[PDB]
Amino acid sequence: STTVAQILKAKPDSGRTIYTVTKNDFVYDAIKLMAEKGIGALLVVDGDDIAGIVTERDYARKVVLQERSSKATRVEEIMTAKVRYVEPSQSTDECMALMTEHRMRHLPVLDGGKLIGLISIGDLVKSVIADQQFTISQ
Amino acid sequence: TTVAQILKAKPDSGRTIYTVTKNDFVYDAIKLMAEKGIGALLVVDGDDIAGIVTERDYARKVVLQERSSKATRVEEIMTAKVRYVEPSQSTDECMALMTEHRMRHLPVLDGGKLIGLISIGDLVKSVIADQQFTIS
Ligand SMILES: NC(=O)c1ccc[n+]([C@@H]2O[C@H](COP(=O)([O-])OP(=O)(O)OC[C@H]3O[C@@H](n4cnc5c(N)ncnc54)[C@H](O)[C@@H]3O)[C@@H](O)[C@H]2O)c1
Ligand SMILES: NC(=O)c1ccc[n+]([C@@H]2O[C@H](COP(=O)([O-])OP(=O)(O)OC[C@H]3O[C@@H](n4cnc5c(N)ncnc54)[C@H](O)[C@@H]3O)[C@@H](O)[C@H]2O)c1
Ligand SMILES: Nc1ncnc2c1ncn2[C@@H]1O[C@H](COP(=O)(O)O)[C@@H](O)[C@H]1O
Ligand SMILES: Nc1ncnc2c1ncn2[C@@H]1O[C@H](COP(=O)(O)O)[C@@H](O)[C@H]1O
């Protein structure tokens, strides 16, 4: 088994950086920040406690299709509150099952109740093939 | 495991491809993605593959550019240079492509004929679909 710890150590710097917004932030500001960092999710924090999680999938489904403006809508209105998480001990296979079964591409990592990072379906796919050999022609 | 097997694994053997035209409005693309529970649409120019548009394009190229989805065409935000695979190819190859090129969707062509579409989630499922897990 390859672990969540190992996935984070591979991440740049060294998975320690979690990009974040508060519940009161405008959705528009969430979307601008995602764009600035090249990411598709933000952990929603209200002063150190995990409030929820908001992603590009949330923005595509719950704003303009609901007659809302990202500028006049707050993150809380579209985020998922019941956040599923993993611990650094868990295997990538377990993580992939969770993502598949619950239809989510992001998993915060809590260690003893401390948020230590965040992993995504992309980090998991990379670990599956990262050491395999390919050709440009293949 | 092959792309063909990934397609076979899907409910209608992956025969359905949810599609839009280059002239359609982004809002109609977005509406349709919601309607069908998906994150991408193949963009057709009346029977030829013109591009691909995903929830990521929508997140990046519309309101952040002062545009409205009712007032913007799919062509404006789509990716015109589409990468694809054929059924012969292995899931590892598809995973590498998605990782290296930062895309989560691959149309599947067979002899220049579109047969279906696979996503990063189809690949991840194949990796663990046979594996045993407990709730605990
Ligand atoms: N070449 C690579 O190193 C690499 C790594 C990861 C993903 N990818 C690919 O790029 C695309 C990335 O999308 P994804 O589907 O994994 O989702 P994503 O775009 O949300 O994730 C991209 C990277 O940013 C990180 N990230 C996302 N949200 C974060 C947050 N709030 N705080 C801190 N870090 C965060 C992820 O852990 C991941 O490493 C996919 O096509 C995937 O295959 C490539
Ligand atoms: N339980 C399952 O069987 C299952 C299967 C696939 C994905 N997932 C999960 O659900 C989420 C789905 O996201 P995703 O990131 O793979 O992207 P997605 O939301 O675009 O894909 C969802 C499913 O719809 C299909 N699809 C998407 N666009 C299509 C189009 N234009 N035409 C035809 N089919 C299309 C995909 O191939 C995939 O099977 C992820 O968390 C993933 O892990 C679960
Ligand atoms: N760790 C998580 N726990 C619970 N829900 C999540 C998590 N990550 C994402 N989601 C939600 O699941 C949906 C898809 O997210 P994603 O596939 O990560 O874009 C969105 O409605 C998200 O808010
Ligand atoms: N098969 C593909 N070929 C080329 N570009 C793609 C492909 N799939 C998605 N993209 C683009 O890559 C970015 C991320 O897409 P996705 O991860 O599939 O949401 C978006 O700008 C898409 O338009």
Author numbering:
A (entry chain B): 2 to 139
B (entry chain A): 3 to 138
What did the publication describing this PDB structure actually write?
Here we report a functional and structural genomics effort that applied saturation-level transposon mutagenesis and next generation sequencing (Tn-seq) to identify essential genes in B. thailandensis, followed by high-throughput structure determination. We used an “ortholog rescue” approach to maximize structural coverage of these gene families, which are likely to be essential not only in B. thailandensis, but also in related, but more virulent, Burkholderia species, such as B. pseudomallei. Using only seven Burkholderia species to select orthologs of essential genes, we solved structures for 49/406 essential gene families, and for 56 total Burkholderia protein targets (including seven ortholog replicates). Of these 56 targets, 25 satisfied criteria for being a potential antimicrobial drug target.
